[PDB]
Amino acid sequence: MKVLVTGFEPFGGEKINPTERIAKDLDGIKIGDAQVFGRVLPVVFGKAKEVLEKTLEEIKPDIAIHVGLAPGRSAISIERIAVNAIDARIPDNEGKKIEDEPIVPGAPTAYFSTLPIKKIMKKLHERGIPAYISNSAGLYLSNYVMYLSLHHSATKGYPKMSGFIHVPYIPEQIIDKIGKGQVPPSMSYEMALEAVKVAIEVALEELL
């Protein structure tokens, strides 16, 4: 059993992206006899797909859990659906701001996450971790990778399960926002990391 967890590099002016640390922290760990691989993806259209594809083919994970930062969200959110579209509100890290364009021409308009999202949410709640099911992962890079991963599953037969989890800003990221006007919600790095670990455990247990 192999699990692939991905995170993203910093973007949009942020000095850090907590999901990058999550990926690195989870890399190489083992839950039971399952091997976990953690990889960081660039916040760049095209390049992110290349890295994603290469990683999936290299590792051929049974389960893929892609993690991203969701500025403004107050709790852990588990994505229900990936949409075949790109409409960036801001440009990617290379200045590309793609609008009204499919991710995979001719492919399904959308794919439902194949992670046991309701069971994951339930377990997180039992752990005292606020979490909810999100019905839109946006149309930026998080949705982009979520869709490509699910399309890979539908087209290649692996990973068996694929999904996306968004985490709020961690506290330290709020500091310089205070003087700028508003104070967005945050969640400790420790809780975000544990949330992803829990999702992996629940997904694994689901695979018989």
Residue numbers of the site for a second copy (CB under 8 A)? Answer: 73-75, 80-81, 83, 85, 87, 89, 100, 108-112, 118, 125, 128-133, 135-136, 138-139, 171-172, 174-175, 177-179, 181, 183-188, 190-191
Shortest gap between Cβ of 27 and a second copy (angstroms)? 24
Shortest gap between Cβ of 202 and a second copy (angstroms)? 16
| CB of 10 or CB of 130, closer to a second copy | 130
Nearest alpha carbon to residue 166 among 190, 197, 191, 192:
192
Number of CB atoms found within 10 A of residue 55's CB: 18
CA dist 115 to 102, 169, 199, Å?
Answer: 23, 23, 9
| CB of 180 or CB of 208, closer to a second copy | 180
d(CA 148, CA 82): 9
Shortest gap between Cβ of 175 and a second copy (angstroms)? 5
| CB of 34 or CB of 133, closer to a second copy | 133
| CB of 80 or CB of 197, closer to a second copy | 80
| CB of 191 or CB of 203, closer to a second copy | 191
DSSP secondary structure letter of residue 169: B
Phi, psi of 205 (to 5 degrees): -60, -30
Q: How far separated are the first and last CA of the chain, in Å rounded?
A: 11
d(CA 79, CA 94): 26
